[PDB]
Amino acid sequence: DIQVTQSPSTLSASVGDRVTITCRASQSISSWLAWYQQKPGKAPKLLIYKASSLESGVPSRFSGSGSGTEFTLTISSLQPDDFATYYCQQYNSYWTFGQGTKVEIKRTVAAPSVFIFPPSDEQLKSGTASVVCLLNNFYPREAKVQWKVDNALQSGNSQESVTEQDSKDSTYSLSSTLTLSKADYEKHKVYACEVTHQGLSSPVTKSFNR
Amino acid sequence: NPNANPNAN
Amino acid sequence: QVQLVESGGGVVQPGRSLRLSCAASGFTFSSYGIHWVRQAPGKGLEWVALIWYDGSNKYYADSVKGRFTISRDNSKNTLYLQMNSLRAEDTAVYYCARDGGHSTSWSNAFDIWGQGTMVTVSSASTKGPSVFPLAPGTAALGCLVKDYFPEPVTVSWNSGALTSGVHTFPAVLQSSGLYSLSSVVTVPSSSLGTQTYICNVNHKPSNTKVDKKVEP
């Protein structure tokens, strides 16, 4: 099996910047490497074939280089529609793609605004309790959200969802939802959401008492 | 060879 | 114009069978080998199978070998993928993709892709969502849109009159096999008792429409 790994996994850059992304094959694929661009929920688009050949109609700001095991894709000057995930693919032995490099819009660090919502009285009638913690309009994407119930760190009973970059301000928002049985929810008092982020000089905790 | 050309010639 | 159109995607229970198809137009379909490629939710691209231009040589990924069968009917300009004994991890958007034909002495990069067809492998029953308030100089409020199947739901605020500052999160698949999401909006603190806020939730697949007013 031939594997191809891309670096980095996420690249932050601004319009007009130059970006070079790399793709390494686990063994020689000669020049049988292709580069594709994919926007979320869209069909992939072929950019480069045979390591350096530009596919017809692809803008000349895209160029590819490399042979053997080391290959790179360079965008000479990023345009606004170039923010996307880029995949390399080797077609030497079967077909294997890389994990993708997400080229993301850079912006200033923005700390999240953190909100906690107790479960509704309506939902508690039904047998399950959902506690929601919201992280609004933050950058960069990396953020850690931890739940504590009566000072016990929660594990295994939360799920996160993150939006795509806001088209106007390029920030992220994130929800973390803690699911408990109403019996467990009514067994405890203090519910806290603790957030760590680059924009925060020290972690921020939002909490309520049931 | 799975990587052989899949098209008519 | 050259075009590839996948069809057949839908909710199918685990262990069952489903036949996808891909219809081509605008080029000599019978001259090209064609691939199936899939992309699981949130994951990367995974090659699935290749068939030659005349339906002779067929190649499969180890993850689908023995369960998936690729075939084609050139008289109908159509490609097929018969999927048997479906597992949950077969849930993905499935693409057909043409060999680019840049070189006649090797296979090629994939130049023409279809839009994809979404296959959801789940035994979940169709269910319209429960809508719960996320009660509130800026205050956040929202609606929790819980336990619905299958995808999608749409959420508006104040019947579309409120769009500034709205964030509707992508759905997450809960361990119950039912989806859940929240829609939140940041508004002025000063009008929290004055300005009415209602989320309008529409679950198209279940004929469900719910309006939930959110108050302090």
**What is each CA distance from C53 to A168, C83, C99, C169, in whole angstroms?**
46, 21, 10, 43
Cα C141-C145-C149 angle, rounded to 5 deg: 165
Phi/psi-derived region of residue A16, left when phi > 0, alpha when psi is between -120 and 50, beta in every other case: left
Helix (H) or strand (E) holding A164: none
Structure-token pair, residue C21: 């198809």
Quote the CA–CA distance of A190 and C211 in Å, as a whole number: 31
CB environment A85-115: b (16+ within 10 A), e (fewer): bbbbbbbbbbbbbbbbbbbbbeeeebbbbbb
Report which of C180, C184, C182 is spatially closest to residue C164, judged by C-alpha positions.
C184
Show which of C121, C156, C173 is a domain's final residue: C121
Q: Alpha-carbon torsion A49, A51, A54, A60, what sign? A: positive
Cα A91-A95-A99 angle, rounded to 5 deg: 105
- Return the number of other C-beta atoms located less than 10 Å from residue C122's C-beta: 17
Strand partners, C82: C19, C69
Contacts of B2 in chain A (CB under 8 A): 93-94
Cα A141-A165-A58 angle, rounded to 5 deg: 115
Q: Which residues contact C24 (CB under 8 A, 6 or more apart)?
A: C3, C4, C5, C34, C77, C78, C79, C96, C98
CATH number of the structural domain spanning residue C29: 2.60.40.10
Quote the CA–CA distance of A11 and A23 in Å, as a whole number: 14
Quote the CA–CA distance of C146 and A203 in Å, as a whole number: 29
Dihedral of CA atoms A78, A82, A84, A86 in degrees, nearest 10, equals -70
Q: Are residues C42 and C117 in the same domain?
A: yes
3-class secondary structure per residue, C109-132: CEEEECCCEEEEECCCCCECCEEE
Q: CB B6 to CB C53 under 8 A?
A: yes
Quote the CA–CA distance of A153 and A36 in Å, as a whole number: 42
Quote the CA–CA distance of C67 and C47 in Å, as a whole number: 15
Q: Is A98 on the interface with C (CB under 8 A)?
A: yes
Longest dimension (CA), chain C: 73
Q: Which of A32, A87, A119 sits opposite C45 (nearest CB)?
A: A87
Q: Which residues contact C211 (CB under 8 A, 6 or more apart)?
A: C198, C199, C200, C201
Phi, psi of C75, rounded to the nearest 5 degrees: -60, -20
Q: How many structural domains are present in chain C?
A: 2
- Return the number of other C-beta atoms located less than 10 Å from residue C84's C-beta: 14
- Number of helices (H), then strands (E), belonging to chain C: the values are 0, 19
Length of chain A: 210
Which one-letter amino acid corresponds to residue C180? S
Q: Are residues C57 and C90 in the same domain?
A: yes
Quote the CA–CA distance of A53 and A104 in Å, as a whole number: 25
Report which of A51, A55, A85 is spatially closest to residue A70, judged by C-alpha positions.
A51
Q: Are residues C157 and C117 in the same domain?
A: no
Q: CB B2 to CB A32 under 8 A?
A: no
Q: Are residues C149 and C183 in the same domain?
A: yes
Structure-token pair, residue C127: 């269910």
Q: Domain limits at C192?
A: 130-213
Q: CB A136 to CB C140 under 8 A?
A: yes
Determine the 3-state secondary structure of A80 from DSSP: helix
Strand partners, A198: none
Show which of C121, C138, C170 is a domain's final residue: C121
Determine the 3-state secondary structure of A160 from DSSP: strand
Q: CB B6 to CB C32 under 8 A?
A: yes
Q: Are A174 and A135 in contact (CB under 8 A)?
A: yes
3-class secondary structure per residue, C58-124: EEECCCCCCCEEEEEEHHHCEEEEEECCCCHHHCEEEEEEEECCCCCCCCCCEEEECCCEEEEECCC
Domain ranges for chain A: 4-105, 113-209
Which one-letter amino acid corresponds to residue A175? S
Q: Are residues C23 and C112 in the same domain?
A: yes
Give the gap in angstroms from C-alpha A49 to the nearest C-alpha of chain B: 15
Say yes or no: do domains A4-105 and A113-209 share a fold.
yes
Strand partners, A160: A176
By what technique were these coordinates determined?
A: X-ray
Report which of A162, A172, A176 is spatially closest to residue A104, judged by C-alpha positions.
A172
Length of chain C: 216
Provide CATH code, domain A4-105.
Answer: 2.60.40.10
Report which of A35, A155, A165, A192 is spatially closest to residue A101, judged by C-alpha positions.
A35
Quote the CA–CA distance of C107 and C186 in Å, as a whole number: 53
Q: Are residues C17 and C62 in the same domain?
A: yes
Q: Are C3 and C111 in contact (CB under 8 A)?
A: no
Q: C-alpha A5: how far from its chain's center?
A: 17
Q: Are residues C10 and C106 in the same domain?
A: yes
Contacts of C170 in chain A (CB under 8 A): 161-163
Quote the CA–CA distance of C42 and A41 in Å, as a whole number: 10
Cα A17-A19-A20 angle, rounded to 5 deg: 160
- Number of helices (H), then strands (E), belonging to chain A: the values are 2, 19
Domain A113-209 grouped into CATH 3.40.190.10: no
Report which of A160, A120, A96 is spatially closest to residue C181, judged by C-alpha positions.
A160
Q: Are A11 and A104 in contact (CB under 8 A)?
A: yes
Structure letter (DSSP) for residue A104: E
Structure letter (DSSP) for residue A110: B
Report chain C's terminal Cα–Cα distance, integer Å. Answer: 56
Among A46, A93, A95, most C C-beta atoms within 10 A, so best to mutate, is A95
Q: C-alpha C19: how far from its chain's center?
A: 17
Report which of C106, C105, C110, C116 is spatially closest to residue C81, judged by C-alpha positions.
C116
Q: Are A124 and A100 in contact (CB under 8 A)?
A: no
Quote the CA–CA distance of C155 and C145 in Å, as a whole number: 9
Quote the CA–CA distance of A129 and A177 in Å, as a whole number: 10
Helix (H) or strand (E) holding A205: strand A204-209
Rg (CA), chain A: 22
- Return the number of other C-beta atoms located less than 10 Å from residue A149's C-beta: 20
Q: Are residues C13 and C117 in the same domain?
A: yes
Phi, psi of C101, rounded to the nearest 5 degrees: 65, 20
Determine the 3-state secondary structure of A97 from DSSP: strand
Q: Which residues contact C160 (CB under 8 A, 6 or more apart)?
A: C200
Give the gap in angstroms from C-alpha A95 to the nearest C-alpha of chain B: 8
Structure-token pair, residue A200: 């925060």
Q: Are residues C9 and C85 in the same domain?
A: yes
**What is each CA distance from C206 to A20, C11, C149, C173, C202, in whole angstroms?**
47, 14, 8, 17, 9
Structure-token pair, residue C37: 């490629």
Residues 156-185 of A with CB under 8 A from C: 159-163, 173, 175, 177, 179
Give the gap in angstroms from C-alpha A2 to the nearest C-alpha of chain B: 13
